[PDB]
Symmetry: D2
Subunit: 233 residues, 4 copies
Amino acid sequence: MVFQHDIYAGQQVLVTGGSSGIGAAIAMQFAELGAEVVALGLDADGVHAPRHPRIRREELDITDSQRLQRLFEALPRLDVLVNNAGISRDREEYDLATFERVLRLNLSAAMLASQLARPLLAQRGGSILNIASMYSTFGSADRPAYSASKGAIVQLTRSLACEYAAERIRVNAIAPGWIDTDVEATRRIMQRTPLARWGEAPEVASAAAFLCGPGASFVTGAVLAVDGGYLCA
Amino acid sequence: MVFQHDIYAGQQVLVTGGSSGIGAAIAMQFAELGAEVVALGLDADGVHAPRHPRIRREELDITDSQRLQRLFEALPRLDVLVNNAGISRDREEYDLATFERVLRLNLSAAMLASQLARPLLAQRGGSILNIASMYSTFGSADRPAYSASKGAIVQLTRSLACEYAAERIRVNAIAPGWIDTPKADVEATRRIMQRTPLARWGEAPEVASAAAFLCGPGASFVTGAVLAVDGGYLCA
Amino acid sequence: MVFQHDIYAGQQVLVTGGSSGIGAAIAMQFAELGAEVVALGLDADGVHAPRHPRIRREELDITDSQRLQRLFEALPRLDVLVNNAGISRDREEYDLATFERVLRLNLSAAMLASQLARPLLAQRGGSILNIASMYSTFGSADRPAYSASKGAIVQLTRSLACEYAAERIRVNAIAPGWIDTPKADVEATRRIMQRTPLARWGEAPEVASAAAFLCGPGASFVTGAVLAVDGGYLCA
Amino acid sequence: MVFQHDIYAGQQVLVTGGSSGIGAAIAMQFAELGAEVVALGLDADGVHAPRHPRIRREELDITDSQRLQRLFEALPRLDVLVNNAGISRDREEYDLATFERVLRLNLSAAMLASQLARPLLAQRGGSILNIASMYSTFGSADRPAYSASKGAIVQLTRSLACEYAAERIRVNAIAPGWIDTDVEATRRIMQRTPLARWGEAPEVASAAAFLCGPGASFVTGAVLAVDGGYLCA
Ligand SMILES: NC(=O)c1ccc[n+]([C@@H]2O[C@H](COP(=O)([O-])OP(=O)(O)OC[C@H]3O[C@@H](n4cnc5c(N)ncnc54)[C@H](O)[C@@H]3O)[C@@H](O)[C@H]2O)c1
Ligand SMILES: NC(=O)c1ccc[n+]([C@@H]2O[C@H](COP(=O)([O-])OP(=O)(O)OC[C@H]3O[C@@H](n4cnc5c(N)ncnc54)[C@H](O)[C@@H]3O)[C@@H](O)[C@H]2O)c1
Ligand SMILES: NC(=O)c1ccc[n+]([C@@H]2O[C@H](COP(=O)([O-])OP(=O)(O)OC[C@H]3O[C@@H](n4cnc5c(N)ncnc54)[C@H](O)[C@@H]3O)[C@@H](O)[C@H]2O)c1
Ligand SMILES: NC(=O)c1ccc[n+]([C@@H]2O[C@H](COP(=O)([O-])OP(=O)(O)OC[C@H]3O[C@@H](n4cnc5c(N)ncnc54)[C@H](O)[C@@H]3O)[C@@H](O)[C@H]2O)c1
């Protein structure tokens, strides 16, 4: 409907957390537009993992730094990196070990992946897309580590945008709203969302396809809200 | 070479400030993608005005409220409104009458256009795109009215996003960085370039491509948003 | 019981919208701390107007530009300007004339007052304090002109902070949350309270204490800033 | 000049990174207004450490979680916690171990300190003050971990503001500009600062004394810029 069929033909994309939810939809969207895609994640062949002849599914815990490095070293080419893998442990995040676990996946692994991707992305130029959150803006009483990590990922986006510009690598983020991947909480969220519905994973994916392509040639360091207006209400 | 050719086939777009610069490029981008476009502005047939068989060029000062209303009433259909018209009078903006002139075009005319567009946009749903500025974020000593007006246009974007959502009218903004629209100030260029990670001027079609995305079906869950198209300027 | 009694002894403060609510509390707070204060507003001697021997109450519609200028010209001295006057007409703000009325008071009058104050504030340095809003951040479907005006006042704050810094005039804003100024809407109260971490209305003197800090020598490196005094509302 | 002499009389304050720079000035400011203060940091008796009869100087690496916990357990009372300790390793932050070191001190230790302080602060109510940065807003090519950590600390501030409100604990941050604690870089910074000078440590301290006191009773989740206008230019 929106993009020309082969706009990423001949390109290589790697999506962390590609094995379900938003990552799976992003992987599918790039594959559908001609890219070869590596969908990295846990339970890489599970029910929610994306099936497509141009998507290779790979089981990998990206906090395993050495294993991640080997994977990147084996890649002959990379045009786009999507740092999508993210977790929350809700109120268990008040436990320090758990807080640190959440940061390590949500932030530190994204930093490492970006640095491992960097020499490949510099070959022809390319892009990085990080996934932020409403909690990059609002605080969360129930998930302090998640909120902290998402504030961090926005500043990492802006910092790597500055650093990688000279290598023609653009670095952006999407801040999704409540994406369908407690009656009272649902009602609260829906009342505060102008569009009054859940966001859908493919809607984040369509934004990803735009931000990582040549129509966004002057876009770097940006955070695009894909949230049905939630931030505004 | 990003979008399918007919995304906007059968649709009607109206771009204020369509007679030069960013507005002209936005008008051309929508026309390219199949839309009929009305390009409203001053000097509507000037050298910088967009030429295309699907672009109607119309001379209209949009601060003329009655004339603007008549134009909108004559439209049988409208799918997208782009509130792009904007001016600055630099340090003359310290004069109150001039300050108010800048606000009247940059903000009040955008409010009026949005309200005149609303019943048409509500028919099938549609979108509004406002043009913000780096000065929606940073202050400007040399153009206080411009900066004020662009902070206003961002809150207007968010407010109308809330109001118009129930009519399926999405309302977003682009905050362009420094776009080469007809710079001779060597020192200013150097200052801007030092603060722009991509180290160049933006081009009007680069703003236009973002407009084509935000106003289309790939942005169905995007409303109230401000997208920076600025080469990283906000980050440095 | 926070500030020393004479921090503003020998100084002159002018508060627009000083005749009720937040403005009245700000005027009282500066008067408490030794300042002579002019409280400008409508119904200047009404029930909500601040009574104090160091507060002169003056009836003045600040959209009357010539009258405002005469008042400022009569002042022998000015150290602090508080642009607090603000109005909303809720959904009547969809009417353009009303939209412009709200902008004219909330933004343009603040610009004029700032410029009239400027030569006096430049004598020894001094400060300007603007009053923003939660709707400088969030949009408001029910008051688009109010929200637009408050986004504008934040960018005006930042712009004049840049412009006036070389004259040692600091320019800041407070963004108050929901302040109990004379609520009967049970549903609205419940919505606001659910989103306020401190789970209560703010009180006018609580905004006033922040004003006393921002405009004083403990805030010597604070300019262009917006301080939220909102019980956490922006965070929830 | 600004505050009444005994406004924090009888109260207990703990400042992390209290042994130099901004932390030292904050410690002095609270002590001068009547508080008993623990100034925790490295080189706790060094030249820059604050000397005052109401300031106890304590040598403690706050990444030593067990030692920090013991210190908090020994406190009979706490009214204000200032999470001021912060580091940067500049471009060495591109090394993952170093990136993680910076996060661990700048963010995780602040989370732990806040949680250890929480039961004491809940006794009578009280406040937490975190120290943010210009790089909570702007990215930094030369210090990505620092910028990430400071984006994180702003979201942690907002998250703990939401969580701790019911216990009458207010949680705020100051975003200092360039504080005097490369000719070309100096010139750039000074040209972009409207007040055209360095900020001074006591100027951050005066803001701290306001935010943690009863004149800021309705202020929580706030970030106050103390930056000479830098953010605006
Ligand atoms: N769902 C929402 O409403 C929402 C809102 C805002 C932001 N986000 C962000 O979107 C991203 C994806 O979330 P989702 O909603 O699709 O969740 P999800 O749980 O459906 O998917 C998470 C993905 O991350 C992967 N993952 C987790 N730990 C991993 C590890 N150690 N190594 C490798 N992969 C790992 C999972 O295997 C999975 O593929 C996250 O960063 C999340 O914070 C989601
Ligand atoms: N050029 C930049 O770098 C830049 C950066 C950020 C934002 N912007 C914004 O982009 C928008 C377009 O600016 P541009 O750079 O293309 O400038 P431009 O001067 O080339 O375009 C101005 C357009 O607005 C029209 N206009 C002016 N007054 C009008 C009136 N009274 N009635 C109707 N139309 C009127 C003009 O005729 C013209 O078509 C403005 O809103 C501007 O603030 C521009
Ligand atoms: N009440 C809140 O919860 C709240 C929240 C955020 C911001 N604010 C802002 O605080 C400020 C004060 O509002 P308030 O709640 O105290 O309201 P209020 O209605 O009690 O005060 C309005 C004041 O402005 C004056 N005013 C109105 N029109 C004027 C004119 N033409 N000329 C001169 N003075 C005029 C009034 O006479 C009065 O003194 C406003 O800027 C408002 O937007 C209020
Ligand atoms: N100086 C500036 O311009 C500036 C600007 C913005 C933010 N900040 C922030 O202000 C805070 C203080 O910085 P400063 O400029 O005073 O720096 P500084 O180096 O003078 O002081 C840092 C303090 O943190 C302590 N510290 C470091 N590692 C520690 C550990 N493991 N355990 C305990 N204490 C430790 C040090 O011993 C010292 O007391 C930091 O959070 C910094 O990011 C400073």
